[PDB]
Amino acid sequence: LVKNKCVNFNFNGLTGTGVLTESNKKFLPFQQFGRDIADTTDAVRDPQTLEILDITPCSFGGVSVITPGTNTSNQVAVLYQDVNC
Amino acid sequence: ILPVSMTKTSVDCTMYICGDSTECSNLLLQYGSFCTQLNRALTGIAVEQ
Amino acid sequence: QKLIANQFNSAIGKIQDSLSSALGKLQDVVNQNAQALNTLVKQLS
């Protein structure tokens, strides 16, 4: 098991890529899957040691380039939108 | 009470329509201009707001 | 001048008490956006 890293998994019902952060809420004994307000999988139960892990996508935002303009400079600044870094 | 702006959202087809598949990206080449226009409209909306 | 100042202070207190008792214009501009986003996610299913 690898946690806090962007990995792919197949937890018997889905094929989602994301990190597995340690949770703070306990599930019911017969709950195997999780759900939120939207129709996106956000929680799942590990069948090994009955551990609850969160789901978080890693691809956030895009790439923004800052340019001083023409006839002024030649170097640019690279900005990422909404990712931790 | 008078609102002046609201939430700024940016949506791209490469993350919404297609997930982690390559066939969807190949099939979206025929509709790439549509997504370019939608992204430009959303960018202009964000800039105006 | 004292009467008008007291009237202004009482009016300010009145709008302070009335605002604490909800907003309609500021709540819709978030509610329709939330509904549109929810419909956007729901269309994926």
Binding site: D36, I37, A38, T40, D42, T56, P57, S59, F60, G61, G62, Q81, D82 | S5, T7, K8, T9, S10, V11, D12, T14, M15, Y16, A46, Q49 | L19, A22, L23, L26, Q27, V30, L37, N38, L40, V41, L44
Partner: peptide, 24 residues
């Protein structure tokens, strides 16, 4: 501020405003 009160999990990112609440 207190009177008036996932969605980003499918690529629907949100851009923060240029002017923050403290600047306003």
């Amino acid at each position: 501020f207190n009177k008036v009160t996932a969605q980003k999990f499918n690529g629907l990112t949100v851009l923060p405003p240029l002017l923050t609440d403290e600047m306003i």
